[PDB]
Write a protein that binds this ligand. Structure first.
Ligand SMILES: *[C@@H]1O[C@H](CO)[C@@H](O[C@@H]2O[C@H](CO)[C@@H](O)[C@H](O)[C@H]2NC(C)=O)[C@H](O)[C@H]1NC(C)=O
Ligand SMILES: CC(=O)N[C@@H]1[C@@H](O)[C@H](O)[C@@H](CO)O[C@H]1O
Ligand SMILES: CC(=O)N[C@@H]1[C@@H](O)[C@H](O)[C@@H](CO)O[C@H]1O
Ligand SMILES: CC(=O)N[C@@H]1[C@@H](O)[C@H](O)[C@@H](CO)O[C@H]1O
Ligand SMILES: *[C@@H]1O[C@H](CO)[C@@H](O)[C@H](O)[C@H]1NC(C)=O
Ligand SMILES: *[C@@H]1O[C@H](CO)[C@@H](O)[C@H](O)[C@H]1NC(C)=O
Ligand SMILES: *[C@@H]1O[C@H](CO)[C@@H](O)[C@H](O)[C@H]1NC(C)=O
Ligand SMILES: *[C@@H]1O[C@H](CO)[C@@H](O)[C@H](O)[C@H]1NC(C)=O
Lengths: 326, 49, 97, 193, 48
């Protein structure tokens, strides 16, 4: 549970378009530079307290794992980790790559050579079964598409996590469609290794492309005043002098909502479903005041032929407060 | 006169923010709160221009 | 972004030229001759235009009268920023800027 | 392609930004939705009982499924509806298909039924490469693309090179207005040369 | 036909959302009576 600094790690391609020899900057969910990652330890049995908890997906995740004998196999995403909700598994043995989304009956801890990943699964929706060492991954899930980024390299580190810049690459665009909230890590069983976990935050990054679609360098504009200056002047090399800087430092993270405490409910079952509507030349006007507008109790029975609003959007109507309604 | 011209230019630049430029409101907060951004993007484009 | 880098470059070029103009006009000589102790040069009373060692400021009397003539109602580099948390009568243009 | 079957009054609800009972708890379209939605009435072919979600705690994210029936113990949250030919106009059975497609710098898989023609080089011609229309001069190119690249871009976002879908190779595109021209004249009342 | 309007006046019809705690002297996203925004909320000596 130790915190390890991750300097300039976690860079991936947030967009699929092709860019060559440009200095592009964008606002998206990235791993912040020099952020603290939690360290978890793992390596029959191996040695005492070497286990894995249930982590938090958030809006993105950076998974970096160090291995010596391929002890880490895969991940199990989900929301509630029961069979009341759906889950996905991405694990492998042989050269067998297994990816499927089902309602799983999970074990307490997954071991997989002796393949104790699940007890059983039912109502399987999407199945695409096809078949000293540092591998790292980035997982994101928006608009019903789990994107996977990875890179893989050979190292000789006895302890700790090496520092540097790392760019990842897309492989999969799997259309799962499930709600992902929390995940786990699947470890193998036999007849030191450790992994580090970081979460993505909404920030502004600037990237340099080496005219081949390959990222040369990346700048996090919220790190230090030097990077903010570099993002402001839109360049990587800065001449000596004084320059004014824009705002790239502070960002809100929490929500405050304050509404009046009107608990009474006003009748949409009497104005709408009245006894007898009048003639068109004798149309009636009724003032509505001092209540709460729900618009969701009609979802059960009444279906609307047309509902069109002028000056407001129907989707934004639930968050609005009105002064006078007729 | 130089000081007054500079002050008047700055005050005019501040006061020109009250023009909606054809949007349904001058300030951006009720543009974002009143509509979804599918058409509020078009609304904010005019203000930006 | 390119529509804003041009504006920033133009305003910095204006500001450096404004700093250069005062350098060009006043600092013609690079030798700072100290003020002589006497002020009467053959009956010529120079005490009104040379600074005197009896004021908190180092300006001459005529320079003080000139500096009192111009009213700096506009602000921007002498007003404190934290002063911008006033009342409805403190809703001035400078804090809005 | 996304396929389902709904009522006839909810065909207005499958639209970007519009709310309802289907766009809230059953099926919501993405915000920047590029694609095409098609819906067609089968009031006679499909009959019987079908279900929809009426109660849920939160808004659904775009393109998100939810098979979690019986939220809690005995709280079904799947109200049913019936399809017979006698049902009124707004309440008829409509089959809905949503085609979500995208195009980018990648080899294409689905195309239209048009026959390819011969390519003319070193002339100002109108070209149609994989649906991208334009006007220019096509020349053999010494440029080098990637394995998946189809067209290159300048710093002004102008396409200068393209990949031929047949006999895969790179072709450069040049403007027809090939240079700057000055005209030197005396007065028109004096001469016309 | 629902004809409704909103202005600088107390509201009578609102949506079903629960109020939360207010955080002061921090950059927060606020939703005051249907008006959304981002800013820092401080105690005010102004008079309405
Ligand atoms: C030079 O002229 C001034 C008047 O313009 C004489 O009076 C002095 O005036 C200044 C301010 O203008 C005062 O600070 C001095 O105290 C004044 N001096 C006296 C003696 O009253 C000044 O005296 C003249 N210089 C000489 C040497 O006579
Ligand atoms: C083919 C398939 O669906 N799953 C296979 C499984 O049968 C096999 O035992 C395993 C090897 O460990 O690789 C995977
Ligand atoms: C002009 C040039 O040589 N560019 C090279 C490219 O050929 C090479 O593929 C890439 C990395 O492999 O690095 C760059
Ligand atoms: C949230 C909730 O329970 N709403 C109920 C709904 O379930 C029920 O069907 C209806 C009467 O039929 O009354 C209302
Ligand atoms: C790790 O970094 C985070 C964010 O920079 C910070 O909040 C936390 O205090 C740091 N922890 C340690 C032990 O330095
Ligand atoms: C899985 O479902 C069975 C019944 O189908 C139930 O008894 C069991 O508790 C469920 N387990 C989990 C982890 O949801
Ligand atoms: C209106 O109310 C009556 C009885 O109160 C009910 O039979 C009818 O179905 C209701 N109409 C709608 C559209 O819900
Ligand atoms: C058809 O396509 C292949 C490769 O896609 C190409 O080599 C060939 O020239 C094309 N035309 C014919 C007539 O085969």
């Amino acid at each position: 549970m130790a915190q390890v600094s991750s300097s300039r790690r976690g860079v991936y391609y947030n967009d699929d378009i092709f860019r060559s020899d440009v200095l592009h900057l964008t606002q998206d969910y990235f791993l912040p530079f020099d952020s603290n990652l939690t360290q978890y330890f793992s390596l029959s049995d191996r040695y005492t307290y070497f286990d894995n908890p249930i982590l938090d997906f958030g809006d993105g995740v950076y998974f970096a794992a160090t291995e010596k004998s391929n002890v880490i196999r895969g991940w199990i995403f989900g929301s509630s980790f029961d069979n009341t909700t759906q889950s996905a598994v991405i694990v492998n043995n042989s050269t067998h790559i297994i990816i499927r989304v089902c309602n799983f009956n999970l074990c307490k801890e997954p071991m997989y050579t002796n393949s104790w990943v699940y007890q059983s699964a039912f109502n399987c929706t999407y199945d695409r079964v096809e078949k000293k060492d540092l591998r790292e991954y980035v997982f994101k899930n928006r608009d019903g598409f789990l994107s996977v980024y990875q890179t893989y390299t050979a190292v000789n580190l006895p302890r700790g996590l090496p520092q540097g810049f790392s760019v990842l690459r897309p492989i999969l665009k799997l259309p799962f469609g499930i709600n992902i909230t929390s995940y786990r890590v699947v470890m193998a069983m036999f007849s030191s290794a450790a992994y580090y976990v970081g979460n993505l935050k909404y920030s502004t990054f600037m990237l340099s492309f080496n005219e081949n679609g390959t990222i040369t360098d990346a700048i996090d504009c919220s790190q230090n005043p030097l990077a903010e200056l570099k993002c402001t002047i839109k360049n990587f090399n800065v001449n000596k002098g004084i320059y004014q800087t824009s705002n790239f430092r502070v960002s809100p993270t929490q929500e405050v909502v304050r509404f009046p405490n009107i608990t009474n409910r006003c009748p949409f079952d009497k104005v709408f479903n009245a006894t007898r509507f009048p003639n068109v030349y004798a149309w009636e006007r009724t003032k509505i005041s001092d209540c709460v507008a729900d618009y969701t109790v009609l979802y059960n029975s009444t279906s609307f032929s047309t509902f069109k609003c002028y000056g407001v959007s129907p989707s934004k109507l639930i968050d609005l407060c009105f002064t006078s309604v007729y | 006169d130089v000081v007054n011209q500079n002050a008047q230019a700055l005050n005019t630049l501040v006061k020109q923010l009250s023009s909606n430029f054809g949007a349904i409101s001058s300030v951006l907060n009720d543009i974002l709160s009143r509509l979804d951004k599918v058409e509020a993007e078009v609304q904010i484009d005019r203000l930006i221009t | 972004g390119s529509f804003c880098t041009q504006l920033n470059r133009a305003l910095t070029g204006i500001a450096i030229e404004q700093d250069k103009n005062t350098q060009e006009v006043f600092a013609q000589v690079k030798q700072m001759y100290k003020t002589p102790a006497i002020k009467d040069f053959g009956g010529f009373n120079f005490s009104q235009i040379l600074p005197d060692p009896s004021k908190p400021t180092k300006r001459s009397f005529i320079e003080d009268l000139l500096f009192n003539k111009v009213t700096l109602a506009d602000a921007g580099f002498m007003k404190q920023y934290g002063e911008c948390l006033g009342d409805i009568s403190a809703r001035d243009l400078i804090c809005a800027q | 392609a996304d396929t389902f079957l709904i009522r006839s009054s909810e065909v207005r609800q499958v639209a970007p930004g519009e709310t309802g009972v289907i766009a809230d708890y059953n099926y919501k379209l993405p915000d920047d939705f590029t694609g095409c939605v098609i819906a067609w009435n089968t009031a006679k072919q499909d009959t019987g009982n079908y279900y929809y979600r009426s109660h849920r705690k939160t808004k659904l994210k775009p393109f998100e499924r939810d098979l979690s029936s019986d939220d809690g113990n005995g709280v079904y949250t799947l109200s049913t509806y019936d399809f017979n030919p006698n049902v009124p106009v707004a309440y008829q059975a409509t089959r809905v298909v949503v085609l979500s497609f995208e195009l980018l710098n990648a080899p294409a898989t689905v195309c239209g039924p048009k026959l390819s023609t011969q390519l003319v080089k070193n002339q100002c011609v109108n070209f149609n490469f994989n649906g991208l229309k334009g006007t220019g001069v096509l020349t053999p190119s010494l440029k080098r693309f990637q394995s998946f690249q189809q067209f290159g871009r300048d710093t002004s976002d102008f396409t200068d090179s393209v990949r031929d879908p047949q006999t895969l190779e790179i072709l450069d595109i040049s403007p027809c207005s090939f240079g700057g021209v000055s005209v030197i004249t005396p007065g028109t009342n004096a001469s016309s040369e």
